Structure 1
Amino acid sequence: KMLGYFSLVGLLRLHSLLGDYYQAIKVLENIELNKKSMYSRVPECQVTTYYYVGFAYLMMRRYQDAIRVFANILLYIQRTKSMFQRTTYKYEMINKQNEQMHALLAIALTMYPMRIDESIHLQLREKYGDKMLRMQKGDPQVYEELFSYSCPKFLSEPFLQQLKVFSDEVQQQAQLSTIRSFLKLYTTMPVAKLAGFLDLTEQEFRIQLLVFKHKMKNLVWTSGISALDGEFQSXXXXXXXXXXXXXXXXXXXXXXXX
């Protein structure tokens, strides 16, 4: 049935290239089949399946599922920041395809967690490293320019990607994260400090709007907003502490076992 699964995956991919998102998703849902047959038949097929899963995740709002499938197809940085190293068994062309898939995953990968990893990736290229720096900067002007220059990469069929839709959506999510990163933690905040920080965002009026909008998102919490004063206000602990202690013990265990 492995061949049939491959046919399904290929057909689904074709539909996605010329096909609607939901039907392809349904095909993907049917599609998964035992790992082992694929492993016995060839190294590459599993990688292709992982790539398909990653694509589905990308179509899906969640980047988590795709993050797992892509790492398995290719090595990815693990939670707790340990290197994940993939097998080199698959045929070199297949491996190149896998590398391309990994490059695609970076987009999913950045969303999943952190932070500035390109160690597996070649140092010299500024295509991905530059993008990472721009995200780190937290300023769109550099981000926008990065899309503008590497307009060619996004385009690569033209009808299939007429408008660059996905990249733009991703960038808009990316812009929001830094503001949440201050993440309140202040009981009461001067308006002017908020204005200075929100000013950087392209819309001048966003803070009156941009700040309230952030509250609606719920990524960050604002207190006293819309107030006459105009100044924003901003067992559980034990559980958190216990959690940390657990992590420490885990690290020690791995050390001892090692």
Structure 2
Amino acid sequence: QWLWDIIDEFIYQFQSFSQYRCKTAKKSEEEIDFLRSNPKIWNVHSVLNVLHSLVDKSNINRQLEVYTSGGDPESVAGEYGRHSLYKMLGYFSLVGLLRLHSLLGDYYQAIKVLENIELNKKSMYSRVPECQVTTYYYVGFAYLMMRRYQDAIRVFANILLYIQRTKSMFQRTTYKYEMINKQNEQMHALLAIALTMYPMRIDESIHLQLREKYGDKMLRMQKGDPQVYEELFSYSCPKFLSPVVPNYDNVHPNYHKEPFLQQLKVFSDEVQQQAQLSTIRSFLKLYTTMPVAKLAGFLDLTEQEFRIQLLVFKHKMKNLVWTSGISALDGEFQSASEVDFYIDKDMIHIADTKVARRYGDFFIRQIHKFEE
């Protein structure tokens, strides 16, 4: 207990948000002039959705462990929000991509996200920095499971622009820069753990001491080890649903692990499937041009039971990606370049320091007129 007034204080406002803002608040003037003259804080409309997103995850784990079917904050977040957020005449505020990341976000607690190109299209307003960290991490983890892996370098590079120019000034992240920037580079490095070794997107971004901490992990992938499905799965384990708090822990019947067997046990068996491609990619190309004697020379050099090994060499070569045409007369395999890219961060680091040289001069030129 001690958390039941935490929901009940804020959901009494969240009851009103479907009531006021969808039904009647297109010509509502009297609540507006209360919010201009009385209070001291101006940013409550970004407080009132996003702190309500926090407090409902605090009570989804509470209610779903006390009521399975038709939970009450499953009702007030899920069954009230979505048509009430977008559909009305123009809410000329910062809520534009904010409300769809609730609408995609409540489409994301249950795993059924299929909608990436449709919400890409519909936006006419600008982006919030709180919006930008969640939306590449949401659709990139969607593409981590929906396996657009050659564009997964593009989605997780987009989040890592890293120019903060810090704005705190009263907790405006909220609580979520350092945790989620830890998150999005980790699955990015776990992309370099799963999809070995095509990025070359964390090598030019960050230092090499952190990349060797995963570097201990990714060399376990290659020939031999059973924990490589497990280190991929357990480091994603606070990232699948992210549950925050139980209020009642009674294990006689548990009645909280039945939603855990919903997501977690069936999500783990596909992490065994993730490093299977890494066992297809367990020969990095060191010998890539062969005769037909050295394809069968590759059949016995990889493993025993060499003839017929082509029934399991095709199992060793075909998971999503592998491209070479084989000859039968002269036996020529083909060779696909692992080729270097070149330094574009010399350009970007001019733009890193030129925004910093102007802004260190921008903020502190006010200082020369604040105190002198």
Task: Classify the TM-score, shorter chain.
Answer: 0.3 to 0.5
Match of 1:249 in 2: none
Does the Cα contact within 8 Å between 1:51 and 1:73 map onto a contact in 2? Answer: yes
Q: Is the 8 A contact 1:53 1:70 kept in 2?
A: no
**Residue-pair matches, total:** 236
Give 3-state SS (helix, strand or coil) of 2:182's partner.
helix
Q: What is the TM-score when the length of structure 1 is the normalising length?
A: 0.44
Call closer, same or farther: CA 1:89–1:57 in 2, change over 3 Å: same
Report which structure shows greater RCO (CA 8 Å, sep ≥6): 2
Is the deviation greater in 42-51 or in 172-181? 172-181
Show structure 2 runs of 5+ residues with no match: 1-86, 243-257, 338-372
How far residue 42 of structure 1 moved from its aligned partner, in angstroms, is 3.2
- Separation in 1 of the partners of 2:144 and 2:106? 14
| Matches of 1:17 and 1:36, distance apart in 2 | 13
Q: Deviations over 1:200-221 (max 9, x none)?
A: 9899689725544248728899
1:107-153 residue CA offsets vs partner (Å, 9 max, x unmatched): 57657545984972672687522122224667778777887999999
Greater Cα radius of gyration, structure 1 or 2 = 2
- Asked if 2 retains the 8 angstrom alpha-carbon contact of 1:57 and 1:66, the reply is yes
- CA 1:131–1:33: 2 relative to 1, 3 Å: same
Superposed CA deviations along residues 167-207 of structure 1, whole A, max 9, x for unmatched, are: 65455454555666768998997999878976898996897
TM superposition shift of 1:51: 0.9
How big is the shift at 1:228?
Answer: 16
Q: In the superposition, relative to structure 1, how do residues 220 and 50 fare at CA in structure 2: closer, same or farther (>3 Å)?
A: closer
When residues 73 and 153 of structure 1 are mapped into structure 2, their CA distance, relative to the original with a 3 A threshold, is closer
Q: Write out per-residue CA displacement over residues 6-39 of structure 1, whole angstroms, 9 at most, x where no aligned residue.
A: 9999999999999999998986636766899899
Deviation (angstroms), 1:46: 0.9
Look up the SS of the partner of 2:259 in the other structure. Answer: coil
Greater CA drift, 69-78 or 40-49: 69-78
CA spacing shift, 1:35–1:7, aligned 2, 3 Å: farther
In the alignment, which residue of structure 2 is the partner of 1:46?
132
Q: Does 1:191 align with 2:292?
A: yes
Note the C-alpha offset of 1:70.
Answer: 1.6
Change (3 A) 1:173 1:235: closer
1:93 aligns to what SS in structure 2?
A: helix
- Cα root mean square deviation, aligned: 8.8
Work out the CA distance in 2 between the residues paired with 1:2 and 1:120: 44
**Contact map agreement 1:74 1:86 (CA 8 A) in 2:** no
Q: What do the CA deviations read for 1:44-65 (whole angstroms, capped 9, x no partner)?
A: 2111111112022112122233
Q: Deviations over 1:78-123 (max 9, x none)?
A: 9999999999999556645555565565557657545984972672
Change over 3 Å in CA distance of 1:169–1:21 after alignment to 2 = farther
CA distance in structure 2 between the aligned counterparts of 1:80 and 1:112, rounded to whole angstroms: 33
106-115 vs 184-193, greater mean Cα deviation: 184-193
Residue 43 of structure 1 deviates from its aligned partner by 1.6
Structure 1 residues 183-192 or 89-98, which shifts more? 183-192
Unpaired runs of 5+ residues, structure 1, are 237-258
Counterpart Cα distance in 2 of 1:18 and 1:34 = 11
SS at match of 1:136: coil
Q: In structure 2, what is the Cα distance between the partners aligned to 1:143 and 1:118?
A: 27
Q: Which residue is 1:78 aligned to? A: 164
Point out the more displaced range, 2-11 or 106-115. 2-11
Report if the CA contact (8 A) 2:96-2:123 is conserved.
Answer: no
TM-score (norm 2): 0.34
Residues 117 and 20 (structure 1), Cα distance of their counterparts in 2 relative to 1, 3 Å cut: same
Task: Provide closer, same or farther for how the CA distance between residues 94 and 104 of structure 1 changes in structure 2, counting only shifts above 3 A.
Answer: same
- The answer to which of 66-75 and 31-40 deviates more is 31-40
